[PDB]
mmCIF file of N, CA and C (backbone and C1' of nucleotides) in Angstrom:
data_model
loop_
_atom_site.group_PDB
_atom_site.id
_atom_site.type_symbol
_atom_site.label_atom_id
_atom_site.label_comp_id
_atom_site.label_asym_id
_atom_site.label_seq_id
_atom_site.Cartn_x
_atom_site.Cartn_y
_atom_site.Cartn_z
ATOM 1 N N UNK A 1 -9.976 0.536 0.769
ATOM 2 C CA UNK A 1 -9.304 1.847 1.210
ATOM 3 C C UNK A 1 -9.102 2.559 0.075
ATOM 4 N N UNK A 2 -9.019 3.947 0.475
ATOM 5 C CA UNK A 2 -8.824 5.080 -0.768
ATOM 6 C C UNK A 2 -7.611 5.930 -0.318
ATOM 7 N N UNK A 3 -6.719 6.058 -0.984
ATOM 8 C CA UNK A 3 -5.639 7.062 -0.633
ATOM 9 C C UNK A 3 -5.182 7.869 -1.719
ATOM 10 N N UNK A 4 -4.203 8.726 -1.694
ATOM 11 C CA UNK A 4 -3.659 9.400 -2.796
ATOM 12 C C UNK A 4 -2.075 9.160 -2.848
ATOM 13 N N UNK A 5 -1.536 8.914 -3.929
ATOM 14 C CA UNK A 5 -0.151 8.690 -3.971
ATOM 15 C C UNK A 5 0.575 9.809 -4.819
ATOM 16 N N UNK A 6 1.617 10.180 -4.421
ATOM 17 C CA UNK A 6 2.432 11.207 -5.245
ATOM 18 C C UNK A 6 1.505 12.288 -5.861
ATOM 19 N N UNK A 7 0.324 12.608 -5.117
ATOM 20 C CA UNK A 7 -0.604 13.536 -5.499
ATOM 21 C C UNK A 7 -1.569 12.929 -6.397
ATOM 22 N N UNK A 8 -1.328 11.584 -6.888
ATOM 23 C CA UNK A 8 -2.257 10.783 -7.802
ATOM 24 C C UNK A 8 -3.322 10.028 -6.856
ATOM 25 N N UNK A 9 -4.444 9.573 -7.418
ATOM 26 C CA UNK A 9 -5.351 8.973 -6.480
ATOM 27 C C UNK A 9 -5.061 7.508 -6.665
ATOM 28 N N UNK A 10 -4.839 6.767 -5.428
ATOM 29 C CA UNK A 10 -4.689 5.365 -5.408
ATOM 30 C C UNK A 10 -5.668 4.721 -4.469
ATOM 31 N N UNK A 11 -6.169 3.713 -5.059
ATOM 32 C CA UNK A 11 -7.297 3.092 -4.104
ATOM 33 C C UNK A 11 -6.852 1.610 -4.026
ATOM 34 N N UNK A 12 -7.137 1.064 -2.941
ATOM 35 C CA UNK A 12 -6.826 -0.423 -2.510
ATOM 36 C C UNK A 12 -7.888 -1.106 -1.666
ATOM 37 N N UNK A 13 -8.656 -1.877 -2.401
ATOM 38 C CA UNK A 13 -9.816 -2.707 -1.903
ATOM 39 C C UNK A 13 -10.800 -1.658 -1.130
ATOM 40 N N UNK A 14 -10.970 -1.938 0.074
ATOM 41 C CA UNK A 14 -11.794 -1.159 0.978
ATOM 42 C C UNK A 14 -11.003 0.102 1.426
ATOM 43 O "O5'" G B 1 6.797 -16.426 14.754
ATOM 44 C "C5'" G B 1 6.516 -17.454 13.808
ATOM 45 C "C4'" G B 1 4.951 -17.729 13.943
ATOM 46 C "C3'" G B 1 4.360 -16.613 12.957
ATOM 47 O "O3'" G B 1 3.890 -17.205 11.703
ATOM 48 C "C1'" G B 1 3.371 -16.695 15.135
ATOM 49 P P G B 2 3.777 -16.197 10.432
ATOM 50 O "O5'" G B 2 2.188 -15.854 10.563
ATOM 51 C "C5'" G B 2 1.030 -16.349 10.079
ATOM 52 C "C4'" G B 2 -0.342 -15.966 10.538
ATOM 53 C "C3'" G B 2 -0.679 -14.655 9.867
ATOM 54 O "O3'" G B 2 -1.712 -14.838 8.855
ATOM 55 C "C1'" G B 2 -0.620 -14.459 12.426
ATOM 56 P P C B 3 -2.021 -13.479 7.903
ATOM 57 O "O5'" C B 3 -2.792 -12.669 8.999
ATOM 58 C "C5'" C B 3 -4.121 -12.312 9.054
ATOM 59 C "C4'" C B 3 -4.559 -11.543 10.274
ATOM 60 C "C3'" C B 3 -4.753 -10.167 9.865
ATOM 61 O "O3'" C B 3 -6.181 -9.748 9.707
ATOM 62 C "C1'" C B 3 -3.320 -10.379 11.806
ATOM 63 P P A B 4 -6.647 -8.609 8.818
ATOM 64 O "O5'" A B 4 -6.135 -7.180 9.418
ATOM 65 C "C5'" A B 4 -7.201 -6.269 9.969
ATOM 66 C "C4'" A B 4 -6.508 -4.881 10.311
ATOM 67 C "C3'" A B 4 -6.097 -4.273 9.028
ATOM 68 O "O3'" A B 4 -6.808 -3.266 8.613
ATOM 69 C "C1'" A B 4 -4.171 -4.461 10.632
ATOM 70 P P G B 5 -6.634 -2.496 7.171
ATOM 71 O "O5'" G B 5 -5.634 -1.307 7.691
ATOM 72 C "C5'" G B 5 -6.153 -0.148 7.788
ATOM 73 C "C4'" G B 5 -5.098 0.837 8.678
ATOM 74 C "C3'" G B 5 -4.302 1.531 7.617
ATOM 75 O "O3'" G B 5 -4.665 3.094 7.916
ATOM 76 C "C1'" G B 5 -2.752 0.227 8.760
ATOM 77 P P A B 6 -4.197 4.182 6.740
ATOM 78 O "O5'" A B 6 -2.863 3.945 6.479
ATOM 79 C "C5'" A B 6 -1.767 4.650 7.104
ATOM 80 C "C4'" A B 6 -0.569 4.893 6.222
ATOM 81 C "C3'" A B 6 -1.154 5.259 4.903
ATOM 82 O "O3'" A B 6 -1.059 6.729 4.538
ATOM 83 C "C1'" A B 6 0.569 3.618 4.783
ATOM 84 P P U B 7 -2.345 7.341 3.844
ATOM 85 O "O5'" U B 7 -1.768 7.886 2.432
ATOM 86 C "C5'" U B 7 -0.889 6.972 1.738
ATOM 87 C "C4'" U B 7 0.446 7.694 1.256
ATOM 88 C "C3'" U B 7 0.245 8.247 -0.105
ATOM 89 O "O3'" U B 7 0.298 9.495 -0.199
ATOM 90 C "C1'" U B 7 2.073 6.537 -0.040
ATOM 91 P P C B 8 1.073 10.449 1.047
ATOM 92 O "O5'" C B 8 2.515 9.806 1.028
ATOM 93 C "C5'" C B 8 3.580 10.778 1.187
ATOM 94 C "C4'" C B 8 4.749 10.361 0.419
ATOM 95 C "C3'" C B 8 5.758 11.313 0.521
ATOM 96 O "O3'" C B 8 7.195 10.477 0.687
ATOM 97 C "C1'" C B 8 5.169 11.444 -1.691
ATOM 98 P P U B 9 8.070 10.569 2.038
ATOM 99 O "O5'" U B 9 6.956 10.400 3.212
ATOM 100 C "C5'" U B 9 5.755 11.262 3.504
ATOM 101 C "C4'" U B 9 4.967 10.795 4.511
ATOM 102 C "C3'" U B 9 3.824 9.936 3.980
ATOM 103 O "O3'" U B 9 3.921 8.770 4.728
ATOM 104 C "C1'" U B 9 2.851 11.804 4.842
ATOM 105 P P G B 10 3.305 7.353 4.093
ATOM 106 O "O5'" G B 10 4.310 7.122 2.855
ATOM 107 C "C5'" G B 10 5.633 7.879 2.818
ATOM 108 C "C4'" G B 10 6.637 6.875 2.168
ATOM 109 C "C3'" G B 10 6.445 6.924 0.654
ATOM 110 O "O3'" G B 10 7.357 7.735 0.125
ATOM 111 C "C1'" G B 10 6.391 4.620 1.609
ATOM 112 P P A B 11 7.240 7.906 -1.545
ATOM 113 O "O5'" A B 11 7.659 6.497 -2.371
ATOM 114 C "C5'" A B 11 8.996 6.586 -2.687
ATOM 115 C "C4'" A B 11 9.420 5.155 -2.976
ATOM 116 C "C3'" A B 11 9.309 4.925 -4.555
ATOM 117 O "O3'" A B 11 10.487 4.934 -5.242
ATOM 118 C "C1'" A B 11 8.515 3.180 -2.871
ATOM 119 P P G B 12 10.421 5.044 -6.719
ATOM 120 O "O5'" G B 12 9.959 3.619 -7.515
ATOM 121 C "C5'" G B 12 10.824 2.569 -7.191
ATOM 122 C "C4'" G B 12 10.268 1.462 -8.037
ATOM 123 C "C3'" G B 12 9.531 1.891 -9.333
ATOM 124 O "O3'" G B 12 10.195 1.963 -10.340
ATOM 125 C "C1'" G B 12 8.243 0.235 -8.046
ATOM 126 P P C B 13 9.776 2.850 -11.662
ATOM 127 O "O5'" C B 13 8.607 1.994 -12.424
ATOM 128 C "C5'" C B 13 9.163 0.826 -13.203
ATOM 129 C "C4'" C B 13 7.866 0.141 -13.875
ATOM 130 C "C3'" C B 13 6.977 1.062 -14.615
ATOM 131 O "O3'" C B 13 7.187 0.994 -15.988
ATOM 132 C "C1'" C B 13 5.572 -0.372 -13.088
ATOM 133 P P C B 14 6.220 1.742 -16.945
ATOM 134 O "O5'" C B 14 5.351 2.512 -15.942
ATOM 135 C "C5'" C B 14 4.070 3.236 -16.421
ATOM 136 C "C4'" C B 14 2.918 2.910 -15.753
ATOM 137 C "C3'" C B 14 1.611 3.553 -16.215
ATOM 138 O "O3'" C B 14 0.629 2.690 -16.763
ATOM 139 C "C1'" C B 14 1.974 3.879 -13.897
ATOM 140 P P U B 15 -0.423 3.077 -17.972
ATOM 141 O "O5'" U B 15 -1.198 1.837 -18.231
ATOM 142 C "C5'" U B 15 -2.393 1.445 -17.773
ATOM 143 C "C4'" U B 15 -2.611 0.163 -16.951
ATOM 144 C "C3'" U B 15 -1.972 0.447 -15.649
ATOM 145 O "O3'" U B 15 -2.590 -0.174 -14.665
ATOM 146 C "C1'" U B 15 -0.547 -1.009 -16.931
ATOM 147 P P G B 16 -4.183 0.462 -14.234
ATOM 148 O "O5'" G B 16 -4.013 1.411 -13.201
ATOM 149 C "C5'" G B 16 -5.038 2.291 -12.663
ATOM 150 C "C4'" G B 16 -5.047 3.827 -13.102
ATOM 151 C "C3'" G B 16 -4.089 3.651 -14.651
ATOM 152 O "O3'" G B 16 -4.859 4.280 -15.384
ATOM 153 C "C1'" G B 16 -3.009 5.166 -12.902
ATOM 154 P P G B 17 -6.542 3.950 -15.605
ATOM 155 O "O5'" G B 17 -7.113 5.526 -15.236
ATOM 156 C "C5'" G B 17 -7.011 5.811 -13.841
ATOM 157 C "C4'" G B 17 -6.888 7.425 -13.698
ATOM 158 C "C3'" G B 17 -7.921 7.984 -14.550
ATOM 159 O "O3'" G B 17 -8.416 9.155 -13.844
ATOM 160 C "C1'" G B 17 -5.794 8.601 -15.566
ATOM 161 P P G B 18 -9.030 8.923 -12.345
ATOM 162 O "O5'" G B 18 -7.690 8.347 -11.489
ATOM 163 C "C5'" G B 18 -7.749 7.863 -10.214
ATOM 164 C "C4'" G B 18 -8.031 6.179 -10.407
ATOM 165 C "C3'" G B 18 -8.277 5.669 -9.000
ATOM 166 O "O3'" G B 18 -9.195 4.518 -9.001
ATOM 167 C "C1'" G B 18 -6.082 5.026 -9.823
ATOM 168 P P A B 19 -8.880 3.365 -9.975
ATOM 169 O "O5'" A B 19 -10.288 2.753 -10.200
ATOM 170 C "C5'" A B 19 -10.979 1.944 -9.166
ATOM 171 C "C4'" A B 19 -10.271 0.621 -8.766
ATOM 172 C "C3'" A B 19 -11.479 -0.617 -8.805
ATOM 173 O "O3'" A B 19 -11.027 -1.574 -9.563
ATOM 174 C "C1'" A B 19 -10.291 -0.373 -6.827
ATOM 175 P P G B 20 -9.757 -2.215 -9.379
ATOM 176 O "O5'" G B 20 -8.666 -1.209 -10.074
ATOM 177 C "C5'" G B 20 -7.252 -1.183 -9.487
ATOM 178 C "C4'" G B 20 -6.445 -2.012 -10.694
ATOM 179 C "C3'" G B 20 -5.459 -2.722 -9.882
ATOM 180 O "O3'" G B 20 -5.782 -4.083 -9.970
ATOM 181 C "C1'" G B 20 -4.422 -1.271 -11.532
ATOM 182 P P C B 21 -6.420 -4.933 -8.626
ATOM 183 O "O5'" C B 21 -5.445 -4.306 -7.391
ATOM 184 C "C5'" C B 21 -4.247 -4.950 -6.950
ATOM 185 C "C4'" C B 21 -3.459 -5.505 -8.107
ATOM 186 C "C3'" C B 21 -2.140 -5.893 -7.342
ATOM 187 O "O3'" C B 21 -1.924 -7.373 -7.420
ATOM 188 C "C1'" C B 21 -1.565 -4.222 -9.001
ATOM 189 P P U B 22 -1.177 -8.145 -6.180
ATOM 190 O "O5'" U B 22 0.307 -7.513 -6.264
ATOM 191 C "C5'" U B 22 1.191 -7.676 -7.337
ATOM 192 C "C4'" U B 22 2.389 -7.219 -6.901
ATOM 193 C "C3'" U B 22 2.691 -7.435 -5.436
ATOM 194 O "O3'" U B 22 3.301 -8.522 -5.040
ATOM 195 C "C1'" U B 22 3.562 -5.341 -6.304
ATOM 196 P P C B 23 3.466 -9.213 -3.423
ATOM 197 O "O5'" C B 23 4.594 -8.234 -2.965
ATOM 198 C "C5'" C B 23 5.840 -8.548 -3.225
ATOM 199 C "C4'" C B 23 6.732 -7.315 -2.515
ATOM 200 C "C3'" C B 23 6.607 -7.472 -1.049
ATOM 201 O "O3'" C B 23 7.757 -8.200 -0.437
ATOM 202 C "C1'" C B 23 6.616 -5.212 -1.937
ATOM 203 P P U B 24 7.729 -8.559 1.129
ATOM 204 O "O5'" U B 24 7.946 -7.324 1.757
ATOM 205 C "C5'" U B 24 9.331 -7.114 2.411
ATOM 206 C "C4'" U B 24 9.646 -5.688 2.801
ATOM 207 C "C3'" U B 24 9.249 -5.319 4.129
ATOM 208 O "O3'" U B 24 10.322 -5.346 5.109
ATOM 209 C "C1'" U B 24 8.188 -3.818 2.816
ATOM 210 P P C B 25 10.315 -5.841 6.504
ATOM 211 O "O5'" C B 25 9.561 -4.921 7.420
ATOM 212 C "C5'" C B 25 10.355 -4.066 8.301
ATOM 213 C "C4'" C B 25 9.475 -2.803 8.540
ATOM 214 C "C3'" C B 25 8.721 -2.784 9.792
ATOM 215 O "O3'" C B 25 9.092 -2.294 10.845
ATOM 216 C "C1'" C B 25 7.402 -2.065 8.033
ATOM 217 P P U B 26 9.592 -3.019 12.257
ATOM 218 O "O5'" U B 26 8.280 -2.918 13.191
ATOM 219 C "C5'" U B 26 8.180 -1.914 14.298
ATOM 220 C "C4'" U B 26 7.068 -1.061 14.333
ATOM 221 C "C3'" U B 26 5.905 -1.817 15.221
ATOM 222 O "O3'" U B 26 5.875 -1.102 16.442
ATOM 223 C "C1'" U B 26 5.033 -1.480 13.207
ATOM 224 P P G B 27 6.556 -1.677 17.910
ATOM 225 O "O5'" G B 27 5.393 -2.559 18.526
ATOM 226 C "C5'" G B 27 4.793 -2.121 19.540
ATOM 227 C "C4'" G B 27 3.268 -2.291 19.618
ATOM 228 C "C3'" G B 27 3.088 -3.881 20.217
ATOM 229 O "O3'" G B 27 2.450 -3.568 21.474
ATOM 230 C "C1'" G B 27 2.214 -3.667 17.910
ATOM 231 P P C B 28 2.411 -4.983 22.374
ATOM 232 O "O5'" C B 28 0.968 -5.776 21.870
ATOM 233 C "C5'" C B 28 -0.256 -5.386 22.111
ATOM 234 C "C4'" C B 28 -1.307 -6.274 21.643
ATOM 235 C "C3'" C B 28 -1.244 -7.650 22.178
ATOM 236 O "O3'" C B 28 -2.261 -7.815 23.242
ATOM 237 C "C1'" C B 28 -0.921 -7.939 19.964
ATOM 238 P P C B 29 -2.068 -8.108 24.766
ATOM 239 O "O5'" C B 29 -1.966 -9.701 24.940
ATOM 240 C "C5'" C B 29 -2.950 -10.392 25.479
ATOM 241 C "C4'" C B 29 -3.223 -11.784 24.614
ATOM 242 C "C3'" C B 29 -2.349 -12.899 25.132
ATOM 243 O "O3'" C B 29 -3.009 -13.828 26.134
ATOM 244 C "C1'" C B 29 -1.921 -12.598 22.837
#
RNA sequence: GGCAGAUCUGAGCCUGGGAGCUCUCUGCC
């Protein structure tokens, strides 16, 4: 999974 | 009862410069 946190890039596994 | 998503539109350390983690929540038979 790939998402963005507080504008930052956060990725979690798939 | 276990599973599956979500980041400010989920937060916490950023060790994040984001595959780093960490935790909570919802519906199913």
